[PDB]
Amino acid sequence: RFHSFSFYELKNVTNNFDERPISVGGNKMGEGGFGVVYKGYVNNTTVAVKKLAITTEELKQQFDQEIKVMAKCQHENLVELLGFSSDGDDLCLVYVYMPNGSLLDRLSCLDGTPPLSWHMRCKIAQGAANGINFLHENHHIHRDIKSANILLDEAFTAKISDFGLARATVMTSRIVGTTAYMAPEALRGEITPKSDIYSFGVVLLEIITGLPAVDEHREPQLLLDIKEEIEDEEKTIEDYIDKKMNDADSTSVEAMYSVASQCLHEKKNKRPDIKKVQQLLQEMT
Numbered sequence: 694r695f696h697s698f699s700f701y702e703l704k705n706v707t708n709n710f711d712e713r714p715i716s717v718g719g720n721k722m723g724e725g726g727f728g729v730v731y732k733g734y735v736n737n738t739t740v741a742v743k744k745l746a747i748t749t750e751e752l753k754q755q756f757d758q759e760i761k762v763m764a765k766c767q768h769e770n771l772v773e774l775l776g777f778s779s780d781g782d783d784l785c786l787v788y789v790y791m792p793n794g795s796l797l798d799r800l801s802c803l804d805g806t807p808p809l810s811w812h813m814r815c816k817i818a819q820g821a822a823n824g825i826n827f828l829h830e831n832h833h834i835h836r837d838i839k840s841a842n843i844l845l846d847e848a849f850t851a852k853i854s855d856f857g858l859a860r861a862t863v864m865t866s867r868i869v870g871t872t873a874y875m876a877p878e879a880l881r882g883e884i885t886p887k888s889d890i891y892s893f894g895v896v897l898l899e900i901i902t903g904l905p906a907v908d909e910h911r912e913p914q915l916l917l918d919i920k921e922e923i924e925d926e927e928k929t930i931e932d933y934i935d936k937k938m939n940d941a942d943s944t945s946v947e948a949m950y951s952v953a954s955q956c957l958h959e960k961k962n963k964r965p966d967i968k969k970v971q972q973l974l975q976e977m978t
């Protein structure tokens with residue numbers, strides 16, 4: 694199963710949760726709205742330790758939910774949970790460390806990593822689709838699909854992460870998620886697997902363009918507003934293709950944009966299911 698760690702043990706392996714970046718000898722690897730993720734070594738195993746940090750009971754709900762989803766969903770396109778720590782007021786989750794971080798950070802070439810080739814971007818999108826398919830095949834809604842939550846192993850295999858907001862059409866009183874990726878219905882309170890498909894369409898736009906879904910110092914601020922400029926023929930997808938590539942052919946790029954535009958239908962019932970998205974991505978290559 695999973696290993697129950699004492700909090701002081703994860704304190705030692707993370708060097709007191711050193712907030713300096715791993716790029717300069719620290720332990721901090723990334724940051725989210727619900728915690729900070731640190732690098733460590735547990736018994737020669739490189740690990741990722743997410744220290745959670747919303748009500749306290751709510752954080753325990755997402756802590757318990759992540760464990761329950763990870764206990765049942767094991768797949769090569771999902772991250773793996775090794776253990777956790779629950780003693781005290783601090784909640785921690787221990788995962789197998791991902792040598793290439795998040796897709797978001799690699800699209801931005803954070804810490805000097807080389808730009809991703811289009812060929813590898815295609816394989817990453819396919820792997821992320823296979824991960825979403827496995828979760829949907831087991832009746833789980835991710836509710837926070839974004840490039841920051843798509844991680845990459847040593848061979849750049851795509852692995853979905855962060856299942857604290859996952860659920861098994863329904864409404865809720867507490868709207869959660871990253872607004873730049875969320876479907877219109879999810880911003881209103883609906884919980885449905887079609888919202889995951891819409892968020893994946895934004896990721897495909899991030900993969901094509903290399904631009905993050907939101908950039909405050911950018912015009913347009915939201916990547917979705919750029920798609921609208923392409924629909925109205927005021928721009929084309931070739932004008933926004935990531936220039937940090939040299940192997941991107943227009944046919945495959947337009948094919949991925951077609952999947953993205955289908956995923957990004959405002960009406961959820963017009964969006965394809967993840968199985969159709971999977972097949973369209975396989976036919977793209």
Ligand SMILES: C[C@H](C#N)Nc1cc(-c2ccc3cc(C#N)cnn23)ncc1C(=O)NC[C@@H](F)C(C)(C)O
Nearest residue numbers: 722723730741772788790791792793794795854855
């Ligand atoms: C941006 C992201 C964060 N946070 N980074 C990582 C995440 C994770 C990782 C593994 C499992 C899980 C589960 C959750 C959740 N729930 C979150 N993370 N997680 N393993 C590593 C890194 C990392 O930075 N590796 C170094 C690499 F990037 C580089 C280029 C050498 O610098």
